[PDB]
């Protein structure tokens, strides 16, 4: 479809219509365009380790994709996984350069263990993103503190 | 316009961001003397209006399907172009084709007399 763009005017949020032209919406500079990463715990999702694990799975045939966000939410619950296959070989890829853990986490749940790895990459079964430092990825990277959330695109007040 | 349909909503937003002011206390802009990776962020709070924050959470939920399909289409690993693309689309909507001064697709207003 089309990536929705949200307009904020006098503390009122409206979704921009791709067909309707609103001349009142003003964009004086690119600094008014912000991408926000809102964490799933804000939506009240279950944050315990056994319940969050059920939201992630392995699948081959889908290459990983990453987007940037400029602002994130302080997360009370973040996760850091070190899952390995029974034979000992690592099950998650080490994070490439530039990808760092979520900047602000209070409780970091160190998830470890050994299980069968059915695929090449760990994806979010509900469609959300694994939010890292200013980068939103579709894939869980080994040993890096992430916080599952989603991304919005806003045009901010002047 | 948005309306929240999520089960719950946290009406207060405690945020972090680097895209903010740097008072530039002398020699702190220099990376050698600059802050470390953990201290490059600023903070803030938007508890003022409960309704706007709950609307943001639904928008971030609703943009997910279109954003995920966007990433399926592109081939590069990391996509920063999205925000610069939205600005180009913004200008192309208003100033893309011929602009009729009093027309509906032209944001031109004649002077006040």
């Amino acid at each position, epitope marked *: 479809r089309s990536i929705p763009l949200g307009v904020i005017h006098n503390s009122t949020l409206q979704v921009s219509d791709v067909d309707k032209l609103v001349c009142r919406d003003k964009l004086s500079s690119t600094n008014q365009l912000r991408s926000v990463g809102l964490n799933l*715990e*804000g939506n*009240g999702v279950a*944050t*315990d*380790v056994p319940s969050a694990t059920k939201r992630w799975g392995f699948r081959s045939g889908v290459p990983p994709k990453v987007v940037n966000y400029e602002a994130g939410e*302080w997360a*009370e*619950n973040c996760y850091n996984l070190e899952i390995k296959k029974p034979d000992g070989s690592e099950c998650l890829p080490a994070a490439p350069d530039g990808i760092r853990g979520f900047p602000r986490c*209070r*409780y970091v749940h160190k998830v470890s263990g050994t299980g069968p790895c059915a695929g090449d990459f760990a994806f979010h079964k509900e469609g959300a993103f694994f939010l890292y430092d200013r980068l939103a990825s579709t894939v869980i990277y080994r040993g890096t503190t992430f916080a599952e959330g989603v991304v919005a695109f806003l045009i901010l007040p002047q | 316009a948005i309306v929240n349909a999520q089960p*719950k*909503c*946290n*009406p*207060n937003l*405690h945020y972090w961001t680097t895209q903010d002011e740097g008072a530039a206390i002398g020699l702190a802009w220099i990376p050698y003397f600059g802050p470390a990776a953990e201290g490059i962020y600023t*903070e*803030g*709070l938007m*508890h*003022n209006q*409960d*309704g706007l924050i709950c609307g943001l959470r639904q928008l971030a939920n609703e943009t997910t399907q279109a954003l995920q399909l966007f990433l399926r289409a592109t081939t590069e690993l990391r996509t920063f172009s999205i925000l610069n693309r939205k600005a180009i689309d913004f200008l192309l909507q208003r100033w893309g084709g011929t602009c009729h001064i009093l027309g509906p697709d032209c944001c031109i207003e004649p002077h006040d007399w």
Partner: antibody
Amino acid sequence: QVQLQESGPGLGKPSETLSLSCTVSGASIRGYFWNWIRQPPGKGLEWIGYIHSTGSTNYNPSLKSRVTISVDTSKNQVSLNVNSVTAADTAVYFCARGAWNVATVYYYYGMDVWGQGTLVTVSS
Amino acid sequence: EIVLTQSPGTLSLSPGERATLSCRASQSVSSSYFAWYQQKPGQAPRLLISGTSTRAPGIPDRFSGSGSGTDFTLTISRLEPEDFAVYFCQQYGNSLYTFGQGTKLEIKR
């Protein structure tokens, strides 16, 4: 094992400024909201106000003029000052942690942790 | 303006019985983050139920919370002697809390 502890003078001279101090232990003040509740002896609870660790504050509509809440992250304390103190302000004063969720437990902005309460009698 | 009126004011009934405590909102809640508190003598109030229906950790299954937008209700089923306290309803909304009059509950014997 987070514990709150209010501190305040047992007697406050009338028409003066009254100061109480809440001291959080076993948990960092950063990232939570912190309330001030007062309870006149033998009556219901009244919410004085709340304050975030960053500093943004909103107070009770009926008391916003005579009150001012403040936080000090270096001391891990939240302070409360009431000015123009009369005899009605005689009460036990609580501080409470009204948080959206802590760790895996959701509290939905319900106040989970309270202080022990400090009684303040206002008399000449 | 946002005032929470609690009923009944006082109440006394025997162990085993069911106590139903009500609390009406003056204006409709714009954020249903309702809560119920139990205050033992000389103690700070304890959190029984938050978010209209979710029990706080360590609160027995007897305490159950429910609501309908304007009227919210707490039911203490199968009453035991330890439930002697005063119970307050609470409403967080638009960056402010409000409490209720309180319901003083006596356990007969």
